[PDB]
Amino acid sequence: KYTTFQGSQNFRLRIVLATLSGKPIKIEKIRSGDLNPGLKDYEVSFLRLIESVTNGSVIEISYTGTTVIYRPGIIVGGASTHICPSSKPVGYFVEPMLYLAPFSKKKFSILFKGITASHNDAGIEAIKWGLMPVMEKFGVRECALHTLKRGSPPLGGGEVHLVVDSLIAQPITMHEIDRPIISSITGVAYSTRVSPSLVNRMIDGAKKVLKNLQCEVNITADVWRGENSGKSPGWGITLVAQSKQKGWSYFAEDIGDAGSIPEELGEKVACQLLEEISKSAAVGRNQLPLAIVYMVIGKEDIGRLRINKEQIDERFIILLRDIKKIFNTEVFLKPVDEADNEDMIATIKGIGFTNTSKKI
Amino acid sequence: KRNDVVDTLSKAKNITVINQKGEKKDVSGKTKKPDSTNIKL
Amino acid sequence: SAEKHLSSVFKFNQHILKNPLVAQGIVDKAQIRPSDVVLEVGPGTGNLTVRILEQAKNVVAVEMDPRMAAELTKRVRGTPVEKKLEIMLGDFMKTELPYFDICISNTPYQISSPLVFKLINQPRPPRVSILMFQREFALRLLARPGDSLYCRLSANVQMWANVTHIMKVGKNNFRPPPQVESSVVRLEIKNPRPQVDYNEWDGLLRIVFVRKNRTISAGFKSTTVMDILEKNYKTFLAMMHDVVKEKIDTVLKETDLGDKRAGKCDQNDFLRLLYAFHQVGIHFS
Amino acid sequence: REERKTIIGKLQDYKIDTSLLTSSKRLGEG
Amino acid sequence: WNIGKLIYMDNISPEECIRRWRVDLEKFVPYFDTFEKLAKKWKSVDAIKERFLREMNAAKKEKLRAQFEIEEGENFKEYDTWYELQKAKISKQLEINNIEYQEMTPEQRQRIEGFKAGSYV
Amino acid sequence: KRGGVIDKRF
Amino acid sequence: LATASNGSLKIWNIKTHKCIRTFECGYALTCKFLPGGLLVILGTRNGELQLFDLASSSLLDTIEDAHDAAIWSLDLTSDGKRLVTGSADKTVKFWDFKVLKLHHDTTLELTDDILCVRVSPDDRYLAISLLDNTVKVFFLDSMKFYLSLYGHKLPVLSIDISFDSKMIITSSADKNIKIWGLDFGDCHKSLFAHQDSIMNVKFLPQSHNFFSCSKDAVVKYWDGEKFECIQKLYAHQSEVWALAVATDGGFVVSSSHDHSIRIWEET
């Protein structure tokens, strides 16, 4: 019958995995004990987004809202517009589409409207420089996220356009068993409706932490003012560590609230990135869920990805249990032969998924 | 036809004219754009 | 009274490109970031300018012909990029220019040599500049040590920046066709600026490049070279013709540079020559 | 380059203004 | 306590898993430690430097030989026809599959690869 | 367009 | 009512409109009056800080070398323990009362001279004005720079802090009154209120609305929410140098070059 899940944990992934696998699923007991049970407003909005890009899918919501049964259709994509409720930023909705965009009958051209940043969801600079490059390694040659207008919280008002021109049969098999060597650190600092000084102050803080390093540091100052700068003032930074040897990237991001000092946030995010590099082996933890999903849906072939022990946390475990419930694929881990470090190699056999929606 | 184009230069606002001395002036011929005691007294 | 002022600064008195690929190539090789403001020299009609405006936060166009500035104005009027274009009309070598990250220029060949050093001496210079020069002048910039075209201009520019050839442009690509061939080069100014006195580097380079294919020792045999240099030593003592003769002899002998030719010398060779005179108290400029 | 680095680094030890120094531009005056 | 087995035993909770051999993906940004602690931890750039890029003459060149391999050595690494290249890529990939399975334990192997062709089932 | 969200929530 | 000018310090009772006490002093620039009606502080261009007690009817202590340059402005903390001084010396100096005499605790360097100092009603933060046309806000508890306010065409003459402490209004010689949002440093709106330079702008207590007084002798009432002049009241024939508002906000006083002092009270 239906694969059953409990709670709202990994809600979007469980929906995304079902769409890729084509296996119907049921999610029940969604915030049953809460005073406000059932799906939140943005969760329903996400399901509407899934319906728009897919065709023939049947989605039902329980009369109490605490149970959802999803019968996926085929990914059809097309051109559309989505209005994102203020409860979540655009990055929340753009992220799951990346898992599905390359595998559609027609190219994804989705215009997203709403808040463009938050403390808990991917930003534009995260997606543009932190996630999309990972897809590029997996064979998505043409992918872009255009920023038409930045909308900072709480009023938002931004506009970002997702265009994934590359439609490919399935991801290439991944073979990465070495720790990439970082060549330089790059990033974009952005602000809205405020003076350029705030941007110049954060980069000063970020460079303070990172000046000790032996690699080049160049952080772009992207000051947004005028009609396209949204309705609310806001500011944040994203720092990306780049390894040109094999096109691997590591990134961290945070945004500033009212009452914060830009130099402190620049110091934190610059201090923040170093922590991720220590915890990472081949991909960053915030990149790992995308990397793992792509490998399982590859050809019927063994791909290898090097992962650090720190990356195996609670989030990682639940991802590997959810994926097994859908695809029945088991991720195997073997120690590396080296003794300088304690990394491990994740070997995954792809399920032989093929993009059958595409015209030939 | 020189007069017909000169008005276009004066018509537009985002044009800055540089003289021989190097200063920046608008098309009309005007320069396009402190003591503590004086400001507060 | 627009005619009153514009006529006081101009009298209201060019080979136009017609090859779309070089303009597309020039903008493509610029690799313009979305958060970069571009100084564009020689906008002309605006064929290159409009493309830059699309991918640029701001574009500052500098023009010498009031005719051509208006055609730029008319082309862009009532357009989304109108707010992002600022046109400066008149000579720009004398004016202190604003901040810019990239420079894309269909530069006037008359001001080619002044322009390359204005960018270099521009405080906080552009990281990359795509400049279009003639073959003769450009080949001197790209000239490497020991080559026929190796010269003072090559030696001076190469140490403040790196210049690389992009493409060759034929005289047919313009009309009315110029008598000389054209080229496009990329200039990357070094950050940080190599900490050597601008005057001292020129001073040593000039005296040895009076005859590049002649020995460096001979270049210092000229009587005026001794006189201009002797007083420079009198300056060092203030804050002796035989002595400065002897001091020069030791430097060229110890550095083993007195028997080679400026046309076949590298940056390091001049730097070592520049030092050995400083140790013995001789400063060129 | 590393040889160049020593020289340019050593040049800091011997650096002086140019204001009173007559440039080599005067070379042709004779 | 091999984590390979711990992952797929559903009865053990994930929070129970982590401690034995040593919150949710809605929050994209991963967990981290407090800012001031991180600042103290990363006061110096040690513990990561490896990740970033008459006898002493020899000591310089191995550093630069490796740097040449890293910086620009990927453009320099030959089959006669394009067909052979494609076949080589496939054969290499099939060769890789064999090694991992030869490394693999028999009871695990069927769990990953499944029942290979030729098995009587 | 085939299928969609059927919301019977009161 | 405390009145200060060159070489003279006058105290005026509201009902009598007659001077109860006259105090000799120097070229006093700014006047401040401690809570409880015990003391008044005057800052002279000569550099001296003059402290008087009404009961003593005389100066308690004078510190001629407190600031080498002129003390162009002065303010007090809500507790009143710390006294904030802004002078032409380019350094903000903090004076802490002890039992009574004042001693210096800390100094803050700055690139330009200080035109005005304003301590928030909540005491969280201090706003500083400078000559470069820029306003800066420092955390009072930590003395750490928090945010700047840029874009003014001419120096700000006055800074006031709203009761909620979310917004400050900067009055500058450019003749535009700008309201600034401290939470993110944005200018919500700018109004060309007066034809001449605006000296002082004061939030009405417990009200976002504010009065404003300028050189052209026009004093106006502006609503914070509507951001428009509530009432235009014109009384003086010369420049209105300063304006002060009652704690209750019942009455407001203005002084002009004519030497006339007018009391404004709502009906």
- Structural domain includes residue A27: yes
Tokens representing C235?
Answer: 């300056």
What are the chain B neighbours of C87 within 8 Å (beta carbons)? Answer: 12, 14-16
Using a CB-CB distance cutoff of 8 angstroms, which residues of chain F are in contact with residue A64? 9
Are residues A11 and A117 both part of a single domain?
A: yes
Chain E nearest-CA residue for A9: E24
Structure token pair of residue G198: 């605006």
DSSP state, A227? G
Q: Which of F5, F9, F10 sits opposite A59 (nearest CB)?
A: F5
Residue at A125 is within a domain: yes
Beta bridge partners of G203: G210
Which chains pack against E, by 3+ Cβ pairs within 8 A?
A
Nearest to E108 among A11, A320, A332 (CB): A332
Tell me whether residue C106 is annotated as binding. Answer: yes
Judge if A201 and A265 occupy the same domain: yes
- C278/D24 Cβ within 8 A: no
Tokens of E109: 């192997």
Question: Residues of B numbered 3-32 whose beta carbons fall under 8 angstroms of chain C's beta carbons: which are they?
Answer: 3, 5-10, 12, 14-20, 22, 24-25, 27-29
Q: Pick from A326, A322, A324, A312: which is nearest to A348 by CA?
A: A324
Residue (of A71, A60, A64) closest to A22 by Cα position: A71
Neighbours of A152 (CB within 10 A): 30
Inter-chain residue contact F6 with A61, CB threshold 8 Å: yes
Report the side by side order of strands in the sheet with G219-222: G198-203, G210-214, G219-222, G229-233
Evaluate whether chains G and C are touching (3 or more beta carbon pairs less than 8 Å apart): no
Q: Are A33 and A89 found together in one domain?
A: yes
* A with E: touching (≥3 Cβ pairs within 8 Å): yes
Question: Do residue B36 and residue G131 have CB atoms under 8 angstroms apart?
Answer: yes
What residues in E contact A181, CB-CB < 8 Å? 51-53, 70
Chain A residues close to F4, C-beta within 8 Å: 51, 58-59
Q: Tell which of C278, C279, C280 to mutate to test the D interface (max D CBs under 10 Å).
A: C278
Considering only CB atoms, which residues of chain G are within 8 Å of chain B?
72, 88, 113, 115, 131, 154-155, 157, 173, 197, 199
Question: Is A264 inside a domain boundary?
Answer: yes
Terminal alpha carbon distance of chain D: 39
Q: Which residues of A touch F6 (CB under 8 A)?
A: 59-61
* Helical axes C223-238 vs C241-254, angle rounded to 10°: 100
Q: Which of A222, A244, A274 is the endpoint of a domain?
A: A274
Contacts 24+ apart (CB under 8 A), A137-144: A137/A174, A137/A246, A137/A247, A137/A248, A138/A171, A138/A172, A138/A174, A138/A294, A139/A166, A139/A168, A139/A171, A139/A172, A140/A102, A140/A164, A140/A166, A140/A168, A141/A165, A141/A166, A142/A166, A143/A101, A143/A102
In this structure, are residues A314 and E18 in contact, taking their beta carbons and an 8 Å threshold? Answer: yes
**Cβ-contact A268, A276 below 8 angstroms:** no
CB contact under 8 A, F8 and A61: yes
G34 burial via Cβ count (<10 Å: 0-12, 13-18, 19+): middle
Is A301 domain-assigned? yes
Q: Which residues of C touch D15 (CB under 8 A)?
A: 197
Decide if A326 is inside a domain: yes
From C186, C184, C55, C188, select the one nearest C127 (Cα to Cα): C188
3-state secondary structure chain E: CCHHHHHHCCCCCHHHHHHHHCCCCCCCCCCCCCHHHHHHHCCCCCCCCCCECCCHHHHHHHHHHHHHHHHCCHHHCCCCCHHHHHHHHHHHHHHHHHHHHHHCCHHHHHHHCCCCCCCCC
Is B39 at the interface with chain G, CB within 8 A?
Answer: yes
**What would you measure as the largest C-alpha separation in chain D, in angstroms?**
40
CATH number for the domain that contains residue A22: 3.65.10.20
Residue A122 lies in a domain: yes
Distances from the Cα of C18 to the Cα of C15, C42, D5, angstroms: 10, 15, 46
Q: List chain B residues with CB under 8 Å of G113.
A: 36
- Annotated ligand binding at C278? The verdict is no
The radius of gyration of chain A from alpha carbons, rounded to an integer in Å, stands at 20
G and B touch per CB criterion (3+ pairs under 8 A): yes
A194 and G181: CB-CB below 8 Å? no
Chain A to chain E, count of Cβ pairs less than 8 Å apart? 129
| Whole-angstrom distance, CA of residue A185 vs CA of residue A211 | 11
Residue with tokens 């009298």: C11
Q: What are phi and psi of G231, to 5 degrees?
A: -145, 135
CA of A28 to nearest chain F CA: how many angstroms apart? 15
- Decide if A215 contacts E52 (C-beta within 8 A): yes
Q: Which two tokens stand for residue G158?
A: 């006055």
Pair (A221, A349) in one structural domain:
no
Query: Has C256 been labeled as part of a binding site?
Result: no
Tell if the CB–CB gap between B36 and G157 is shorter than 8 Å: no
| Spatial contact of C138 and C165, defined as CB atoms under 8 Å apart | yes
Same domain (yes/no): A259, A336 = no
Q: Which residues from chain C sit within 8 angstroms of residue B3, using beta carbons? A: 3
| Helix, strand, coil share of chain C (percent; to 5) | 50, 20, 35
Asked if A256 and A324 sit in the same domain, the reply is: no
Residues in chain G within 8 Å Cβ distance of A193: 184, 186
**Token pair for C146:** 């020991």
**Whose structure tokens read 């992962």?**
A307
CA-to-CA distance for G44 and G7, rounded, in angstroms? 9
- Which structure tokens are listed for E41? 């931890």
Do residues A69 and A135 lie in contact, with contact meaning Cβ atoms separated by under 8 Å? no
Q: Could you tell me if A30 and A156 lie in one domain?
A: yes
Say yes or no for a CB contact (<8 Å) between F5 and A48. yes
Tell me whether residues A121 and E28 touch, CB distance under 8 A. yes
For residues A27 and A47, what is the distance between their CA atoms, to the nearest angstrom? 13
Q: Which residue of A has its CA nearest to E38?
A: A271
- Beta-bridge partner residues of A58: A71
Torsion of CA A70, A75, A81, A86, to 10 degrees: 40
A262 and A291 both lie in a single domain? no
Instruction: Tell whether A324 and A305 lie within a shared domain.
Output: yes
Q: How many other C-beta atoms lie within 10 A of the C-beta of residue C198?
A: 15
Task: State which residue of chain A sits closest to G148, comparing Cα positions.
Answer: A197
Q: How many CB atoms lie within 10 A of CB E60?
A: 10
**From CA C207, how far away is CA C219, in angstroms rounded?**
6
Task: Please spell the DSSP secondary structure of A324-357, one letter per residue.
Answer: HHHH----EEEE-S-SS---EEEEEE-------S
Query: Is the residue at A360 inside a domain?
Result: no
Listed residues A259, A274, A289: the one ending a domain: A274
Residue of B nearest to G196 (CA): B39
Chain G contact residues (CB < 8 Å to A): 144-151, 181, 183-186
- Asked if E28 and A245 come within 8 Å (Cβ–Cβ), the reply is no
CATH code of A234's domain: 3.30.360.20
**How far is the C-alpha of G148 from the C-alpha of G180, rounded, in Å?**
10
Residues spanned by the domain of A63: 1-177+275-355
Same domain, A106 and A3: yes
Contact residues, chain D, for C159 at CB < 8 Å: none
Q: Is residue A56 part of a domain?
A: yes
Cis peptide before C176 (omega within 30 of 0): yes
Q: If we measure between CA atoms, which residue out of G54, G49, G52, G56 comes closest to residue G71?
A: G49
Chain G residue with minimum CA distance to B35: G131
If asked whether residues A244 and A324 sit together in one domain, one would say: no
Residue of chain C nearest D26, judged by CA positions: C228
**Chain F residues within an 8 Å CB radius of A59:** 3-6
Give the number of A-G residue pairs with CB atoms closer than 8 Å.
26
With an 8 Å Cβ cutoff, are B34 and G113 in contact?
no
How many domains does one find in chain A?
A: 2
Phi and psi based region of residue A20 (left: phi greater than 0; alpha: psi -120 to 50; beta: remaining): alpha
C232 interface with D at CB cutoff 8 Å = yes
Experimental resolution (Å): 3.9
Widest distance between CA atoms in chain E? 70
Tell whether residue C172 is among the known ligand binding residues: no
Tokens of G130: 């400078």
The C-alpha of E25 sits at a distance from chain A's nearest C-alpha, in angstroms, of 5
Q: Are A17 and A110 in the same domain?
A: yes
Distance from CA of B40 to the nearest CA of C (A): 33
Are A193 and G147 a contacting pair at CB < 8 A? no
Residues 6+ away with beta carbon under 8 Å from C186: C29, C128, C129, C130, C131, C163, C164, C166
C38 bridge partner residues: C59, C102
Contact D20 C203 (CB under 8 A): no
Structure tokens at A346: 């994740």
Partners of chain G (3+ Cβ pairs below 8 A):
A, B
CB contact under 8 A, A317 and E17: yes
**Which of A274, A308, A327 is where one domain is finished?**
A274
| Inter-chain touch A275–E38, beta carbons under 8 Å | yes
- Please indicate whether, in this complex, the C-beta atoms of F4 and A65 are within 8 angstroms of each other: no
